[PDB]
Design a protein around this ligand. Structure first.
Ligand SMILES: [Cl-]
Ligand SMILES: [Cl-]
Length: 245
């Protein structure tokens, strides 16, 4: 609930070689994540990125050998990631494969960087695949929303936000890819969280499953009413899934 501050940094994994933070929503990597890290641990190599408005799992390598190892997993597409989100509307399908290709917007890129293939001025579409599993239906601040688990198999910029918006179920509080009628200026944050991260490096399998922030005990505007799938069970399936070839 509280806004990002330099003194509050949540660590979810710490080894000799890696550190995984639970990045706060509306905090930039490059108030930044670097300053929070400097405050808590008076050289940090980010193994990957996480958007400003997104919270969650962000892996930092603490030495040159650890960075190189992690850089290899990402460049060879051997990393597993999953996210949680609160999306607009009740999604009636239990699972959705979202495969529309994502390109860069040439019409109004400044306001909405990315777009779906086929949309006006969409250029250089790239491979895209997001697996969406519906966890629950409920109301967010009295409006119908779906709590979902998202597993991207590709790394397009703003992929999850573009894909969910393209289905007609944008992320709640998404100021870029939400609809005008959605009044996305009203939620306290954008409801997208990097939940699960597995980086199978040569020396260490950095694997984290952060706490779930989209719970009625933490945000009283979220009122779940129908359970479709169990997140605990889906986390057991995530953990057992082989690393991508
Ligand atoms: Cl990245
Ligand atoms: Cl995204």
């Amino acid at each position: 609930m509280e806004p990002g501050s330099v003194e509050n940094l949540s660590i979810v994994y710490r080894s000799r070689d890696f550190l995984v933070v639970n990045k706060h929503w509306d905090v930039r990597i490059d108030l930044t994540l670097q300053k929070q890290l400097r405050y808590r641990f008076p050289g940090f190599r980010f193994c990957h990125q996480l958007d400003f408005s997104t919270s969650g799992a962000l892996c930092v390598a603490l030495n040159k050998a650890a960075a190189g190892s992690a850089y290899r997993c990402f460049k060879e597409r051997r990393v597993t990631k999953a996210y949680l989100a609160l999306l607009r509307g009740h999604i009636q399908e239990s699972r959705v494969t979202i495969s529309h290709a994502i390109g860069r917007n040439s019409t109004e890129g400044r306001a909405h960087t990315m777009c779906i293939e086929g949309s006006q001025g969409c250029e250089n579409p790239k491979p895209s695949l997001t697996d969406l599993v519906v966890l629950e239906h409920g109301l967010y601040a009295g409006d119908p929303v779906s709590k979902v688990l998202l597993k991207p198999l590709t790394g397009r910029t703003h992929q999850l936000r573009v894909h969910c918006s393209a289905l007609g179920h944008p992320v709640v509080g998404d100021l870029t890819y939400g609809e005008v009628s959605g009044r996305e200026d009203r939620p306290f944050r954008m409801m997208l969280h990097a939940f699960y991260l597995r980086i199978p490096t040569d020396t260490e399998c950095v694997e984290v499953c952060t706490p779930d922030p989209f719970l009625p005990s933490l945000d009283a505007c979220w009122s779940p009413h129908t359970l479709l799938q169990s997140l605990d069970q889906l986390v057991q399936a995530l953990r057992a899934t082989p690393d991508p070839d």
